[PDB]
Ligand binder design. Sequence first.
Ligand code: 118
Ligand code: 118
Lengths: 268, 268
Amino acid sequence: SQIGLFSKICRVTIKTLHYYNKIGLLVPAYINPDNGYRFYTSDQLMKFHQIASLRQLGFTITEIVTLTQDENSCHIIERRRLEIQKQIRDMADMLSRINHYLQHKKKERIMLYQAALKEIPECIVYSKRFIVPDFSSYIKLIPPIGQEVMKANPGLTLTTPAYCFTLYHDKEYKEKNMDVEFCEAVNDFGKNEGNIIFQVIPAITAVTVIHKGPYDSLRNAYIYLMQWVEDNGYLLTNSPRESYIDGIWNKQDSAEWMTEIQFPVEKV
Amino acid sequence: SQIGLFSKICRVTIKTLHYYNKIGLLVPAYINPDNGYRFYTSDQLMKFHQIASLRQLGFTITEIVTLTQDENSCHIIERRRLEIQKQIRDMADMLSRINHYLQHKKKERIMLYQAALKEIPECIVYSKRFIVPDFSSYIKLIPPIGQEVMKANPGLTLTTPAYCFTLYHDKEYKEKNMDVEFCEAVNDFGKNEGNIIFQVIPAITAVTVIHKGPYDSLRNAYIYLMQWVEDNGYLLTNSPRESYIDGIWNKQDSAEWMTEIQFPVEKV
DNA sequence: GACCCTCCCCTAAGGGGAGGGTT
DNA sequence: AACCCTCCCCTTAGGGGAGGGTC
Ligand code: 118
Ligand code: 118
């Protein structure tokens, strides 16, 4: 049976049989040495049946050329099973995220904020945890606190990129008397000085929202990220970080201040 | 911010930034004309965050270009949601099939029947539906039909490849009172003289196993296909077909015979 | 007329490397 | 040596077509 008749038997393309014969899977029974014509037999039809049965299970071709010659191999099936379970767990997540995106675009005409998961590696920061009356005074109190460290610690150098951020160790919404902790990543351990300490901030997976604008409207970003966490079946693991990428130190216009909200989060 | 600093800010590879600059997804704020060095800006990070937020939902790159360049594109998000649900159905199907495959392979070292889900197109057949006293006697009455149809309808040409099957119209198991119908795909219509009639058989999606060996062991393949149907949550929609690939007409060896059992099913 | 072969380029989203540049 | 660039080839499972030959 020539390649066309066999390709009509299996309901498959001739190019598929060519590719298979090239890769070594499903080699034909008789190759005409004069013109190269590939002739097939029903013994090849029964082989293509199991080839298609494995292909319908998601196995890649190099997995099939192992499954069909190394007959005892069973770990390559449990591996694909765990892979399928991971794919389902990711696809359901993506479906919930798309549903949330659609709900938000229906409610508001514009996707002002856009959540995105990212992996934040651990870093050595110098930290000062204290109580502030409000956010405005906290912004004023940060730079002298940084100056104290960079003066009293020779050889201390900031990290590139400059990961400078704050943590909010409250559990409920506190407009005032906020137990904020300011941190700034350093290349290595420095010595403690007074109330300012050093520590390692653990590596986290976090959903992130960048907020372009003034600081007095970060409540919108926090409300959006909390809605995202509650909706998509996630759980806030740790205190929410807030990363200062751009601000009064780098730009003079308040409308171009760029800050990134980070929610350390884990899935339930 | 140079490309090396930006790749660490974004926590992505450099070649990703090169690809996004080449396709036009993320273009640097300023490219040095002589060297070619790409330089980035906070407003490029604000856009890479959008790129990542959309790519974590599984959007293709061109869909991301269409989404960030053209607003009011909620039809593309709906398309992606429908495709996500389709992929979730297919992944759950794959998971159930590989669970069944593991349940059988870790039970018995050899796989006797692989199961493949293939779509059979519609065809024109001549058929004789009659009660057969036994399956052993069933094979005997077929060549009479085969001669009679070619004698009554001259020039009637069978299709290629030959689709010759049996329709087991019994909704319950029995040995001696089998209500079966022998069908054979033919190119064009003919006369319906006698109990042999012409008809079309609707196109079906069917799970199929290929049975190699004599016709007494077919109950094994039928029980296996029923077990597959019950395990994988399919529903048997129509009467099972039995496609005779190889038989007494091509090969004298009874262990070289081949036959394909087809179960018309739908996913419910 | 139909059918079949090899050879070449293409997919999506980058990965890896070679060779050249500059401070 | 540290970064940077462009250019070329590579990944899947085959698709599409050109040019040439065969039944
Ligand atoms: C030590 C402590 C704080 C700051 Sb900064 C800053 C600088 C670079 C990158 C990120 C943050 C600052 C403020 C004024 C002038 C110069 C630098 C800072 C400001 C507000 C909130 C958080 C951090 C700097 C050093
Ligand atoms: C018309 C009807 C049936 C068959 Sb045959 C067959 C052919 C030659 C010699 C003996 C038998 C068949 C099928 C099932 C049971 C008994 C006979 C047949 C079927 C498929 C492919 C090729 C031949 C052929 C023409």
